[PDB]
Amino acid sequence: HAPRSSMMSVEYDGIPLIPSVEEALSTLDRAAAALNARRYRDALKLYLGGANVARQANPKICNLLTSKGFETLNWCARLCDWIEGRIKEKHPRPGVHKVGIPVSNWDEDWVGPFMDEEEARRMWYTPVYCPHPIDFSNLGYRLRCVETGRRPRLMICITMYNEGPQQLKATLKKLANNLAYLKEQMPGDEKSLTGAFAGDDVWQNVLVCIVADGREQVHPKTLDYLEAIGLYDEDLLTINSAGIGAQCHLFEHTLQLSVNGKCLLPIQTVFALKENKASKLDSHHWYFNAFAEQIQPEYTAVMDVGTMLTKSALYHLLFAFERNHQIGGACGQLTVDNPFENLSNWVISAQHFEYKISNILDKSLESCFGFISVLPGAFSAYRYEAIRGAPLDAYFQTLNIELDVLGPFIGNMYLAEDRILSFEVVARKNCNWTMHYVKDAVARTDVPHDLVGLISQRKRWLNGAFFATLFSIWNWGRIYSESKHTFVRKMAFLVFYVYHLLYTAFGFFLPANLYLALFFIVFQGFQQNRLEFIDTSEYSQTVLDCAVYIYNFSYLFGLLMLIIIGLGNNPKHMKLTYYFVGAVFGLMMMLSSLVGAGIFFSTPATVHSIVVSILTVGVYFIASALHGEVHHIFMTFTHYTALIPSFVNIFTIYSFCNLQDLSKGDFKDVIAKRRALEELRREEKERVENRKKNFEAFRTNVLLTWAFSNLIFALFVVYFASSSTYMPVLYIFVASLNTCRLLGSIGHWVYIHTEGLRGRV
């Protein structure tokens, strides 16, 4: 008991015994929050932040703070009058005030046609509150183009989010090259453009709109570059956006760019940096709704950040748009930059081959029928007459209506919604807008050089592609039900719909078909003595079954590991495992390719065999030679064929794995407010949990359907079909698909090379 008494006696003995600018910014931020919550008395009090500090020795900061204080005091007077009621107005907000500060860097040595000092030397900036970008023009926001009276006929969007300065600099240099090429067209000839895109004035009619995604995620080097080109200012942003509470901040500057001894054409640029992170869909929402509804361009082009365009990409797009007068939208060719260089990388070469083949075959076939599912990230352009209303409304339905009402089906559909916009353009009511694919308007992008980055990219691509394909398949009746196309166009669309259904059905069972083809040809030619270049009649009879058993077990274990990994961890720490699986599949397909080549060469090459082989495999080379670019295929065929199983299995599995990856009161009044806030928090948590439950349930159901359909098809073919009664069917199906694609490419080539001469009729 002595330790207890000692401790308690110890406790008993231990028992006895000028304002600031940051303050102004915080108070204005609180006032903005109070005004957001509609507490006008407190908002007026805290706003009256509004003059004593502007002690600053820096002339620019002193002027900015003086102007901000004066504007805030004027706004306080306006709000006080509003509360007094002598001025009646709906939803009061601080007045729109854009501040033009002299740019930090201006080049004394620069060459331009003609320009004014106010536009050239000074940079304009305005923070905007617009919650719904439709009433951007209603709240009084204007752009320098509108203020100066320039009426841009074409606008371009460059969505940018966490990129280095090099990509943006390359994109802007390429755009300047495009503008220079548009300037240098010879007048008074048949081929060149005429009208608003002539020389010496083309730079005024094109506006390049850079939409960021989040002030918290853009690269500091990116911001340093933007300040260097004279389009960003942290001090100006912080001073002039203190109490406005802007959702996005837009800076306007017709920036001048110089490269070596050649000074690029000035580019009319608007850069909308948005405060809260959102999706590329939200960036397009801001861009399209606000800026398009304001200046109303004739053509609207969209490209990602890092896509380098040739000198004639914009020229070819505009030429197509003017000469056709029917195209409701078009997209340029997507190409990997420097394909010849760095040929040692297999992933880069495989991506190059995939892009070239996809473009040529699929895009030519789809452009023949006037409906093209644009590749994600491709440099696509539309005309703002086929997109004005219902197409854009459908495009942004996901943002306008919360994901709970739509469901998971619509959300996964709108993951890559550029295809949805394309379909809505094609099937717009009471209008016949077809689509087009421009071969010569090549837009060079920079694809990932690692298998893990390729895996993530192809996951998002395949998710969007699959569900947009489902949308088109289910809603294809709208083309005949609502649109007014020609009867020939309706029949062509019906034929393409039949082809699309067959192609999508084949691609759904692609893993099962690939497994069956490899198994049958290679391993049941080896086991059952069907490889014409070798006699395995007797052998040991242990290796004969050992080959099939090893192949089956390796394939099944690889598929199980792939499913587990794709369902689980992010494919960035599994680089070694994914490289191992990809290398195993690649080596297996090189073995299969040599086995198939041996079989084809040892076969006495009957007429049916040679026709099928041509029409199945050599269709790639035939279409490439027709289009004039065959060296790319010649170089990248082996690299891509080494990556066919990785592509099919890994990418399809991972894409299907993550379908759910989607973005003066008293004390009684105080207690009631606390209870209401707690209840709203609980309801929001429950609603988010229900959203996640529905999304994950749909993901798992669709994944189970896909995987078990493939497994059941493979088992029923293996157990109930021989190589002689299935492989002819597979060859017929693949030959039919490649025949349709070859006919499409032939039609696209003949259309391009013939429509010029037959333009009179």
Can you tell me which of 306, 391, 408, 566 binds Mn ion, judged by CB under 5 A?
A: 306
Can you tell me which of 106, 474, 557, 716 binds its own copies, judged by CB under 8 A?
A: 557
Whether the CB-CB separation of 434 and 489 falls below 8 Å is answered with: yes
d(CA 381, CA 319): 12
d(CA 470, CA 714): 24
For residue 590, state whether it binds its own copies (rule: CB under 8 A).
Answer: no
Identify whether 418 is a catalytic site residue.
yes
Q: Which residues pair with 380 in a beta bridge?
A: 302, 331
Q: Report how far apart, in Å, the C-alpha atoms of 56 and of each of 5, 21, 25, 63, 235 are.
A: 65, 10, 15, 9, 13
Residue 191 touches which of ligand UDP, its own copies, Mn ion, none (Cβ within 5-8 Å per kind): none
The number of beta carbons lying within 10 Å of the beta carbon of residue 599 is 17
Whether the CB-CB separation of 361 and 740 falls below 8 Å is answered with: no
Whether the CB-CB separation of 600 and 731 falls below 8 Å is answered with: no
d(CA 193, CA 612): 45
Closest separation in Å from C-beta 282 to ligand UDP: 8
For residue 693, state whether it binds its own copies (rule: CB under 8 A).
Answer: yes
Closest separation in Å from C-beta 336 to Mn ion: 11
Can you tell me which of 132, 323, 608, 681 binds its own copies, judged by CB under 8 A?
A: 681
Can you tell me which of 26, 192, 457, 694 binds ligand UDP, judged by CB under 6 A?
A: 457
For residue 56, state whether it binds its own copies (rule: CB under 8 A).
Answer: yes
For residue 680, state whether it binds its own copies (rule: CB under 8 A).
Answer: no
For residue 316, state whether it binds ligand UDP (rule: CB under 6 A).
Answer: no
Window of 584-592, 641-649, 672-680, 743-751 that interacts with its own copies by CB under 8 A: 672-680
For residue 280, state whether it binds ligand UDP (rule: CB under 6 A).
Answer: yes
Window of 108-116, 357-365, 426-434, 703-711 that interacts with its own copies by CB under 8 A: 703-711
For residue 376, state whether it binds Mn ion (rule: CB under 5 A).
Answer: no
Q: Which of 189, 418, 661, 666 is catalytic?
A: 418
Name which of residues 417 to 446 contact ligand UDP (CB under 6 A).
445
Can you tell me which of 143, 175, 202, 305 binds ligand UDP, judged by CB under 6 A?
A: 305
Residue 234 touches which of ligand UDP, its own copies, Mn ion, none (Cβ within 5-8 Å per kind): its own copies
- 399 three-class SS: helix
For residue 609, state whether it binds its own copies (rule: CB under 8 A).
Answer: no
Strands 206-212 and 154-160: parallel
Q: Report how far apart, in Å, the C-alpha atoms of 248 and of each of 127, 133, 156, 237 are.
A: 6, 11, 18, 11
For residue 213, state whether it binds ligand UDP (rule: CB under 6 A).
Answer: yes
Q: Which residues of 726-737 are buried (b: 16+ CB within 10 A; e: fewer)?
A: bbeebbeebbbb
For residue 234, state whether it binds its own copies (rule: CB under 8 A).
Answer: yes
List of residues 6+ apart from 441 with CB closer than 8 A = 309, 310, 312, 313, 314, 315, 316, 317, 320, 330, 332, 333, 379
Can you tell me which of 4, 38, 91, 325 binds its own copies, judged by CB under 8 A?
A: 4
Which among 366, 579, 586 has a CA at the least distance from the CA of 472? 366
Which among 695, 700, 704 has a CA at the least distance from the CA of 411? 695
d(CA 415, CA 461): 9
d(CA 524, CA 528): 5
Per CB under 5 A, residues contacting Mn ion are 304, 306
Per CB under 6 A, residues contacting ligand UDP are 159-161, 163, 213, 279-280, 283, 304-305, 377, 445, 457
Per CB under 8 A, residues contacting its own copies are 4, 7-8, 11, 15, 18, 20-22, 25, 56, 58, 61, 67, 97-100, 137, 142, 146-147, 151, 216, 234-235, 238, 296, 553, 557, 560-561, 563-565, 567-570, 572-574, 657, 660, 664-667, 669-671, 673-674, 678, 681, 692-694, 696-697, 699-700, 703-704, 707-708, 711, 715
Instruction: Point out the residues that are catalytic.
Output: 418
